[PDB]
Design a protein around this ligand. Structure first.
Ligand code: FAD
Ligand code: MHF
Length: 485
């Protein structure tokens, strides 16, 4: 009769089975979001657990969720504290009969679920969890999770052949009255202890948190601007808002459901064009599904330094070299521009993420966990499974069927930034080097350095490694570690 709808990374009213089931019972529904202080502490290497870019986006997303509940006659209860304690107190305060929530798959989130169930079972309060973050739901997979294929291509073949994607649930348009209790202040970044990040106008979007803004972004990218038809051709871009969907920060905290996006793709294919690009956006959502299922199957191994594959590697952890990567002072413009874009905006293109993660692990040989945690801190779109899964894959410990692979920074620079437009946008100190030559500033003569206004070792660093020598050294280490496994 009285149900708390506990929200975490599912900040929406569309495609929300817990909300759908609760509204069908006609009991009193009490939506709740808890700001969990453990989310605003530190990662193991000491970075803010939630940096300022994602913090601002989260606060905007929680405010929008509250507003959207208010529009249909309810509200969102907001509290600060550990949910296993906050919900226990609220259950006693309001004589709650049931708590509904969405299932997570990684250790920290599972510990909260376990502690909550332990706290509530003495009270006889029903706890009901729902699977809701993926395109294909766990129950539609053609295999148990223990038999999830260890290669993505095999996962994709089997689900596309044998499984069905279902339409999103439609949100309710009316809810019972909110209880006569203090609604709760949504805290500021200051109150959470998070440093606010000034806006950099070069941000690919002025990202705004919330289901409302995420739905509008899809409306812009699919319908108003008709970009989806070109997605496969543009998705390796690094400048501009519309080289890709930019749906990721809304998918990561659940402002958008992948099943809602998929329904819109089906509509676009029916109404405009069906081609390799409309499929490829779904293809990338499938990668998102796969990393989440991989984390479900393998549990905490995705966080172990030896990774999903269990390969013990003598990774380096030199702080000075790591800091140079973090600050984009490596001397390689493609890497440096991407790291500085991340530090200024909280976002990095997929093409950039592949390159900087390869540089850290294949050129510097530095522990991939240090990169994964930096991404966790700074990314506006941090998704634990996609981030930690992708870092395992990049580092060669993901069972990806490829062995030692690496990104040739020189070739990637020519292929994806041939005129230097991207690196000059983020590295103004290099912007007067003639196009293309900008990717190898170490080749400039003393006279050219003066003419183009940039002196190596002063205005822009010399390369911190030789690309070829460093990859060869780390390849040998990887090969030996693989042999010893
Ligand atoms: C080292 C590394 C770390 C990453 N960390 C994250 C992370 O924390 N969160 C995150 O959502 N993605 C992460 N990615 C995946 C990918 O780079 C981002 O999803 C993408 O850059 C977001 O831009 P978009 O929304 O415009 O993507 P698009 O190309 O428009 O759209 C694809 C959508 O599908 C998903 N997606 C696309 N590519 C991938 C991929 N390779 N792996 C998983 N999901 C994908 C995202 O939800 C994305 O919004 C990481 C990739 C690498 C190599
Ligand atoms: N949103 C989110 N959820 C998480 O669960 C999560 C993150 N983010 N970011 C990184 C941390 C780190 N995570 C970890 C890290 C270690 C173990 C673990 O069990 N470690 C082994 C040691 C393994 C080894 O040393 O090789 C242990 O027994 O402590 C579990 C989860 C969980 N992580």
């Amino acid at each position: 009769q009285k149900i708390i709808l506990w929200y975490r990374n599912d900040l929406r009213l569309h495609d929300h089975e817990p909300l759908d089931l609760a509204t069908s019972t006609q009991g009193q529904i009490i939506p709740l979001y808890c700001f969990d202080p453990r989310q605003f502490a530190k990662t193991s290497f000491g970075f803010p657990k939630t940096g300022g870019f994602r913090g601002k986006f989260l606060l905007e997303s929680v405010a929008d969720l509250r507003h959207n509940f208010q529009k249909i006659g309810s509200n969102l209860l907001v509290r600060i504290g550990e949910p296993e304690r906050v919900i226990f107190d609220l259950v006693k305060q309001l004589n709650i009969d049931a708590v509904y929530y969405h299932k997570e798959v990684t250790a920290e989130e599972l510990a909260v679920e376990t502690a909550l169930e332990k706290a509530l079972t003495p009270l006889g309060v029903e706890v009901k969890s729902f699977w809701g973050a993926t395109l294909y739901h766990l129950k539609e997979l053609p295999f148990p999770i223990e038999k999830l294929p260890e290669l993505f291509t095999n996962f994709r073949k089997q689900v596309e052949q044998k499984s069905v994607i279902y339409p999103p649930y439609t949100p309710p348009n009316q809810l019972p009255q909110f209880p006569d209790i203090e609604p709760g202040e949504i805290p500021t970044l200051t109150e959470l202890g998070i440093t606010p990040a000034p806006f950099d106008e070069r941000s690919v979007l002025d990202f705004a948190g919330g289901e409302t803004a995420g739905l509008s972004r899809l409306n812009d990218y699919f319908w108003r601007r008709d970009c989806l038809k070109n997605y496969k051709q543009t998705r390796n871009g690094m400048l501009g808002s519309d080289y890709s969907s930019k749906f990721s920060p809304w998918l990561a905290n659940g402002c958008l459901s992948p099943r809602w996006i998929y329904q819109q793709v089906q509509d676009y294919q029916h109404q405009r064009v069906k081609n390799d690009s409309t499929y490829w956006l779904v293809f990338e959502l499938l990668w998102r599904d796969y990393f989440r299922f991989i984390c479900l199957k393998h549990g905490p191994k995705v966080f172990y330094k030896s990774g999903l594959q269990g390969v013990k590697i003598p990774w380096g952890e030199n702080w000075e070299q790591w800091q140079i990567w973090c600050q984009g002072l490596t001397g390689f413009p493609l890497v440096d521009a991407n790291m500085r874009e991340l530090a200024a905006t909280g976002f990095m293109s997929n093409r950039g993420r592949q390159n900087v993660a390869s540089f850290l692990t294949k050129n510097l040989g530095i522990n991939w966990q240090m990169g994964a945690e930096w991404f966790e801190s700074v990314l506006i779109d941090y998704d634990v499974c996609s981030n930690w899964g992708n870092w395992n894959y990049t580092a060669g410990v993901g069972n990806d069927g490829r062995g030692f692979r690496y990104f040739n920074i020189a070739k990637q620079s020519q292929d994806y930034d041939p005129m230097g437009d991207y690196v000059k946008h983020w590295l103004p100190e290099l912007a007067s080097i003639p196009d293309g030559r900008v990717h190898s500033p170490w080749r400039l003569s003393n006279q050219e350095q003066i003419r183009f206004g940039v002196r190596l070792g002063v205005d822009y660093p010399y390369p911190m490694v030789d690309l070829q020598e460093s990859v060869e050294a780390n390849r040998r280490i990887y090969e030996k570690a693989l042999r010893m496994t």
